[PDB]
Amino acid sequence: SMHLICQSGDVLSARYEIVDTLGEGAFGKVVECIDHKAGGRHVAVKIVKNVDRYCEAARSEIQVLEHLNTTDPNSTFRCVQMLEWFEHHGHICIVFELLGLSTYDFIKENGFLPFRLDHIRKMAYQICKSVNFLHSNKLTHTDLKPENILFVQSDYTEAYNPKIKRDERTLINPDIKVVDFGSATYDDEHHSTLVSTRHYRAPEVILALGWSQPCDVWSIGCILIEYYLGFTVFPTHDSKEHLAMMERILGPLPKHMIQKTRKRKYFRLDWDEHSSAGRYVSRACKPLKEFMLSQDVEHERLFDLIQKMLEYDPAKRITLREALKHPFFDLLKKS
Numbered sequence: 001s002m003h004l005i006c007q008s009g010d011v012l013s014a015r016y017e018i019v020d021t022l023g024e025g026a027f028g029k030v031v032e033c034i035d036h037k038a039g040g041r042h043v044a045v046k047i048v049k050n051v052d053r054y055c056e057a058a059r060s061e062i063q064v065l066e067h068l069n070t071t072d073p074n075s076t077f078r079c080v081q082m083l084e085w086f087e088h089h090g091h092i093c094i095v096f097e098l099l100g101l102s103t104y105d106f107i108k109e110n111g112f113l114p115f116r117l118d119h120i121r122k123m124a125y126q127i128c129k130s131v132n133f134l135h136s137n138k139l140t141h142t143d144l145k146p147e148n149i150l151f152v153q154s155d156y157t158e159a160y161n162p163k164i165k166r167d168e169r170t171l172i173n174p175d176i177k178v179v180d181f182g183s184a185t186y187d188d189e190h191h192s193t194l195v196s197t198r199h200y201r202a203p204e205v206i207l208a209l210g211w212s213q214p215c216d217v218w219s220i221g222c223i224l225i226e227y228y229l230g231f232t233v234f235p236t237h238d239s240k241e242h243l244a245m246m247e248r249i250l251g252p253l254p255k256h257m258i259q260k261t262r263k264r265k266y267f268r269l270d271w272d273e274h275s276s277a278g279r280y281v282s283r284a285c286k287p288l289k290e291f292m293l294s295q296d297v298e299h300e301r302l303f304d305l306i307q308k309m310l311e312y313d314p315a316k317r318i319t320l321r322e323a324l325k326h327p328f329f330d331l332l333k334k335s
């Protein structure tokens, strides 16, 4: 089992000494290591489960990162740098530059207090820049979520907050990078039927209509809402209920998408508003703009961008290249 080979003090590839576990996901774990052959530099090492699905993703990710890292050697577009990879007791291990906390862990460890709007603006801009680089290179990420957006540096202050009695982290600089290219898919490759983590999954994915770069835009809009509220507006683990929540937040789905779904197993959604699930969706969900916490124009600008990212029709949906020009980002450009 992986626990036999990922302990503090273990040495991987005769050079990488484990000093901490940074976290786990379905894929395995990421550990922080000292690289004794690079002058003691700390790196991150992703230790992949020895299971075919994950091994296959890791091999794919290695090829995608080789491509992205060679194309953008300065990481101008903020995709994490892979340093090398190796095998350890049958596990694929990928070595990366050491980044800071995931945006998920940062918000979670703060009791789900939302990010400041000024930080959201900077983060959103960088996420759009980064993922647009993928889209410029005939790639779609497919698994964008706060866990896969990491802070570059550990540029925060921490203290034991008297009020809550737990420790709070406060961000100083919000710069990010994008990680996890194990689901990333080239335009000309086989597209998996099911992609994305449910809460970030676009309607064309749910409806098996075909997906491409626009499904990433949908996921980013969901991420930005989460950063702003501290929670998802789609609190569900069921596809039909997910669609009903979309309908309540965004309005009815377009006829053309309903009529294409040859898997019209969900259809007007066939949904009882008066059932337990129906009552839950009406309580939990409301039109998008009602989630705004301020009527100040910068909040309106953020919500306008989110609404465009959550456009049902993936053709009409704003592209990332267009998103970068949106008014929300003007504060970044006001020299």
Ligand SMILES: Cn1cc(-c2ccc3occ(-c4cnn(Cc5ccccc5)c4)c3n2)cn1
Pocket: 022, 023, 024, 025, 030, 044, 046, 080, 096, 097, 098, 099, 100, 101, 102, 147, 148, 150, 179, 180, 181
């Ligand atoms: C999926 N993936 C992560 C990297 C990755 C790459 C470089 C990294 O420098 C630091 C981390 C780091 C910080 N928290 N975590 C926990 C975690 C995050 C995301 C998902 C699971 C665990 C990792 C890190 N991670 C490459 N693929």
